[PDB]
Design an enzyme around this catalytic site. Structure first.
Site, PDB file in Angstrom:
ATOM      1  N   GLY A   1      25.907  13.109 -32.928  1.00 32.65           N
ATOM      2  CA  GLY A   1      26.901  13.353 -31.894  1.00 32.65           C
ATOM      3  C   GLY A   1      26.420  14.182 -30.717  1.00 32.65           C
ATOM      4  O   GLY A   1      25.673  15.147 -30.887  1.00 32.65           O
TER       5      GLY A   1
ATOM      6  N   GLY B   1      27.300  16.070 -26.642  1.00 29.02           N
ATOM      7  CA  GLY B   1      28.212  17.050 -26.067  1.00 29.02           C
ATOM      8  C   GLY B   1      27.465  18.089 -25.239  1.00 29.02           C
ATOM      9  O   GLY B   1      26.545  18.742 -25.736  1.00 29.02           O
TER      10      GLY B   1
ATOM     11  N   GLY C   1      26.606  21.348 -26.904  1.00 31.03           N
ATOM     12  CA  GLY C   1      25.852  21.360 -28.148  1.00 31.03           C
ATOM     13  C   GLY C   1      25.562  19.999 -28.762  1.00 31.03           C
ATOM     14  O   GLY C   1      26.372  19.077 -28.689  1.00 31.03           O
TER      15      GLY C   1
ATOM     16  N   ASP D   1      43.276  20.402 -28.717  1.00 33.18           N
ATOM     17  CA  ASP D   1      42.392  19.273 -28.429  1.00 33.18           C
ATOM     18  C   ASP D   1      42.253  18.178 -29.506  1.00 33.18           C
ATOM     19  O   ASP D   1      41.135  17.752 -29.833  1.00 33.18           O
ATOM     20  CB  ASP D   1      41.007  19.806 -28.061  1.00 33.18           C
ATOM     21  CG  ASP D   1      40.190  18.803 -27.281  1.00 33.18           C
ATOM     22  OD1 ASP D   1      38.957  18.995 -27.185  1.00 33.18           O
ATOM     23  OD2 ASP D   1      40.780  17.831 -26.755  1.00 33.18           O
TER      24      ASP D   1
END
Ligand code: 1FM
Length: 335
Positions: A22, A24, A27, A139
């Site tokens: 993943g 982002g 991070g 979120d």
């Protein structure tokens, strides 16, 4: 020093063999084999420090997660950092290794009428806790909805958590980007509702490219907001702003999610209510007929005790936050 694509990941020797699962801008998330538990795991790196809000959340998701314990919430297994503050320029939170997330699944799979139901149960079930805990996720979204082998679901990311009392985009309640500064439990319902529709259609209901466009997409289905028995949604420059905004008729739910379960829609309706004050609550939502064969009160745990520490919004400057993050992440530091 194992460098995965981007940069470094000082996690070994306990966590070796790295990959990537993943992205982002705050991070990189890699999976890594843990030589101590003999199972791969998820290792999220975070390089906050440059700014504060960043370190503000860094040491906040930690606080939350470390004090929470729910099956529908992916916790912190352990944290890796440097031994000296003056040397600490990145924290790595180790977490479980889920199979896939809700944004990927919908990107291909066609949730059965029940699968949709079972996922939605789990979501609200975890939600009916972060709330009992009096904490707003702020979120919720597919991506933050982890899934594993046996169809387990987990809510991820709590950086925007913050007690009740930049980000997603399409599952943020109308008022977030409009009325009172979010802060309120209904913000999440709306988001959980927005995810519901996508499982029904495998496509975001309010994919507005930007705020304005957003509100339009929304009004698109709920039709012009009410000006009858209002309360905390009225407005001045806005209302007249509508004077430029023609009136749109509410689009019944049958015409979008036609082959969708009669009840699945009724619930989607209580959630996608414009007025937060007439927006179905979390416990009352599990109750709801649609989420039947799953609603199990004597099996749906609620937070141990509410929050209200001392760090909140603003105040504490990085330096001060860094130490805390540091001392907080000390019990996990070997030796
Ligand atoms: C194999 O696919 C995966 C299996 C997983 O188990 C994770 C991810 C991907 C990562 C997704 C990234 C996020 O969706 C997003 O940034 C987020 O949710 C933040 C926490 C993420 C946490 C570390 O993630 C996992 O455990």
């Amino acid at each position: 020093p194992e460098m995965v694509r981007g940069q470094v990941f000082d996690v070994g020797p306990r966590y070796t063999n790295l990959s990537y699962i993943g992205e982002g801008a705050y991070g990189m998330v890699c999976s890594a084999y843990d030589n101590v538990n003999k199972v791969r795991v998820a290792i999220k790196k975070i390089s906050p420090f440059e700014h504060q809000t960043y370190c503000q959340r860094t040491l906040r998701e930690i606080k939350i997660l470390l004090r929470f314990r729910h099956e529908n919430i992916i916790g912190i297994n352990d944290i890796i950092r440097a031994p000296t503050i003056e040397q600490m320029k990145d924290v790595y939170i180790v977490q479980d290794l889920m199979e896939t997330d809700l944004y990927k699944l919908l990107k291909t799979q066609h949730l059965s009428n029940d699968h949709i139901c079972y996922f939605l149960y789990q979501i609200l079930r975890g939600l009916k806790y972060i709330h009992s805990a009096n904490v707003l996720h702020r979120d919720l979204k597919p991506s933050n909805l982890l899934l594993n082998t046996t169809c387990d679901l987990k809510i991820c990311d709590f950086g925007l958590a913050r007690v009740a009392d930049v980000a997603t985009r399409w599952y943020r309640a109308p008022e977030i980007m409009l009325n009172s500064k979010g802060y309120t439990k209904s913000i999440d319902i709306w988001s959980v509702g927005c995810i519901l529709a996508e499982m029904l259609s495998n496509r975001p209901i309010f994919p507005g490219k930007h705020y304005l466009d957003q509100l339009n997409h929304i009004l698109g289905i709920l039709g012009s907001p009410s000006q009858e028995d209002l309360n905390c949604i009225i407005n001045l420059k806005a209302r007249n702003y509508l004077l430029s905004l023609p009136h749109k008729n509410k689009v019944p739910w049958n015409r979008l999610f036609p082959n969708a379960d009669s009840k699945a829609l009724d619930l989607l309706d209580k959630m996608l209510t414009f007025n937060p004050h007439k927006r179905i609550e979390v416990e009352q939502a599990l109750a709801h007929p649609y989420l039947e064969q799953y609603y199990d009160p004597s099996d749906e745990p609620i937070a141990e005790a509410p929050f209200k520490f001392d760090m909140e919004l603003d105040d504490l400057p990085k330096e001060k936050l860094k130490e805390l993050i540091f001392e907080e992440t000390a019990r996990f530091q070997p030796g």
